[PDB]
């Protein structure tokens, strides 16, 4: 497009909205549990009873597909091109697009797997720093490749991460979290703080086998001015990210399954009180697993019909 | 390893409701799934329910559907039993038994089939 | 739905001789199979778990086998406390349908 800025917002978006209840359906439709339990609690009058829905449960292949979505007739999807962009406010130079670019529908805790990168540097967007409630989108520059894979004790699988391309990507991490802290503050990193095992921990789906992979051996630098292996667990009690409730699924699959990844997003939280200050990552929320690559596209209406004053005739 | 104890031959008429407990012991209760199990005498053995302990989710078969009620309490760690609408049938032995199936804290589960331990027996009259 | 009989009802053999007791499926159960056994006056007892596996505490000359619709328990030396009911309990299909064989005699 010509000379024409536009003012960007990805925290109040349309598009997750749309992403989120068609990867529900996905989920819905792909993967049969076995046992569901989702408490229903229909009624200071309440009354909770929960139901008890059984289907059958057999394997089924799992890997995921790019989905582009495209607008229809008379709307069309802006794009923003700004590589150093907050996330919010005005973007200078936006673009008509068709059909955004390639996406990825991966479930994932703790780390962003598989997703898309940035163009010139590490980017850190948030929906207001020193609101300590928000999560922090961390987006890199280069793809850390994590192998993590279960050996031919069936629940038992290894995932090693690179040492060096890791102490690199958090010492930029670390030098651009040092923009916005006064540039003279240590940072820590924690493991986690309590809550369900899907989001204390690496949570995602390999080959349609569940991993629960510690990150303790990830999140433990402090920073002033060869291979990590990591204990991945397959579960088979899950708690459900489409609503509240719990789910059963099978054993798992005798044989090997491999899936490598490019580690190319992260999710912080800040632990504010009252320095330096401690960043343990988080999630949990897969709204905040598409507003970092859903980030730069606003669907629009063109309306072609405009009245203006001249001096012209009848 | 563990133990499991059942309740005292009972008499029942015909139209009562008869309630069966049976406790186990020697572990975590919640680590076992649990089966009630039917044998007449002189006859085979008759699969009746089974029930699934962190979920409190109990299957029943067919021949009997909408007749017995297979209840887990945790506090006292025992499994209970009570059918209603009883008839002559059902005049044999109960077994309650359980199955490891590993660590169902933390999730892991194993849908085991197999009936590992098991108890003495109730002889029950209708 | 699921149906279970198997043709060998009525067995005698003398001591000291292996042994053959099959079990009979109208389809395919894969491997998910159990056999017990049950001396009169007493609980039932574990003897093999997934057709193809040895439990804890029995003996070595209990062998299963076979898949589909079609397994045998060979015993290699028959002694004299193994006079006992047998029983072949499949538990493939989820939810969960299951049954017992109908009990042959030793």
């Known amino acids: 497009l010509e000379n024409v800025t536009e003012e960007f917002n990805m925290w109040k978006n349309n598009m997750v909205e749309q992403m989120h209840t068609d990867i529900i359906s996905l989920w819905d439709q792909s993967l049969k549990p076995c046992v569901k339990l989702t408490p229903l609690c229909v009624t200071r009058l309440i009354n909770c009873n929960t139901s008890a829905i059984t289907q059958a449960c057999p394997k089924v292949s799992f890997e995921p597909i790019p989905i582009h979505y495209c607008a229809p007739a008379g709307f069309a999807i802006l794009k923003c091109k700004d590589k150093k962009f907050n996330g919010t406010g005005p973007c200078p130079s936006v673009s008509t697009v068709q059909c955004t670019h390639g996406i990825k529908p991966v479930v994932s805790t703790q780390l962003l797997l598989n997703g898309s990168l940035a163009e010139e540097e590490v980017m850190i967007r948030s929906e207001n720093i020193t609101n300590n409630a928000k999560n922090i989108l961390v987006q890199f520059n280069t793809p850390v490749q994590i192998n993590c894979t279960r050996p031919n004790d069936i629940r038992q699988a290894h995932c090693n991460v690179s040492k060096a391309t890791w102490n690199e990507t958090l010492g930029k991490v670390v030098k651009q979290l040092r923009k916005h802290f006064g540039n003279n503050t240590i940072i820590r990193f924690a493991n986690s703080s309590g809550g369900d095992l899907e989001v204390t921990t690496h949570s995602f789906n390999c080959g349609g086998e569940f991993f629960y992979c510690n990150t303790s051996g990830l999140f433990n630098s402090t920073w002033i001015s060869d291979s990590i292996t990591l204990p991945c667990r397959i579960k088979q009690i899950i708690n459900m990210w489409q609503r509240i409730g719990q789910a059963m699924y099978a054993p798992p699959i005798q044989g090997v399954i491999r899936c490598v990844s490019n580690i190319t997003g992260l999710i912080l939280t800040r632990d504010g009180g009252s320095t330096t200050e401690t960043f343990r990552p988080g999630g949990g929320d897969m709204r905040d697993n598409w507003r970092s690559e859903l980030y730069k596209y606003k669907v629009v209406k063109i309306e072609p019909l405009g009245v203006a004053p001249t001096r012209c005739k009848r | 390893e563990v133990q499991l104890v059942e309740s005292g031959a009972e008499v029942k008429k015909p139209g009562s409701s008869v309630k069966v407990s049976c406790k186990a012991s020697?572990?975590?209760?919640?680590?076992?799934?649990f089966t009630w199990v039917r044998q007449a005498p002189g006859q085979g053995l008759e699969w009746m329910g089974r029930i699934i302990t962190i979920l409190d989710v109990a299957h029943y078969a067919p021949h009997l559907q909408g007749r017995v009620t297979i209840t887990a309490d945790k506090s006292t760690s025992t499994v209970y039993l009570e059918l209603r609408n009883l008839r002559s049938d059902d005049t044999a032995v109960y077994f309650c038994?359980?199955?490891?199936?590993?660590?169902?804290?933390?999730?892991?589960?194993?849908?085991?089939?197999?009936?590992?331990?098991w108890g003495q027996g109730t002889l029950v009259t209708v | 739905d699921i149906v279970m009989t198997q043709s060998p009802a009525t067995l005698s053999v003398s001591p000291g001789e292996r042994a053959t007791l099959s079990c009979r499926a109208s389809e395919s159960v894969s491997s998910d199979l159990a056999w017990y056994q049950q001396k009169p006056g007493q609980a039932p007892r574990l003897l093999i778990y997934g057709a193809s596996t040895r439990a804890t505490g029995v003996p070595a000359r209990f062998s299963g086998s076979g898949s589909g619709a079609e397994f045998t328990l060979t015993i290699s030396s028959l002694q004299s406390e193994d006079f006992a009911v047998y029983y072949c309990?499949?538990?493939?299909?989820?939810?969960?349908?299951?049954?017992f064989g109908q009990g042959t005699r030793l």
């Open positions: 020697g572990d975590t209760f919640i680590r076992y799934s």
């Open positions: 038994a359980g199955v490891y199936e590993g660590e169902a804290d933390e999730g892991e589960y194993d849908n085991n089939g197999f009936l590992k331990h």
């Open positions: 309990q499949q538990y493939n299909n989820w939810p969960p349908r299951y049954t």
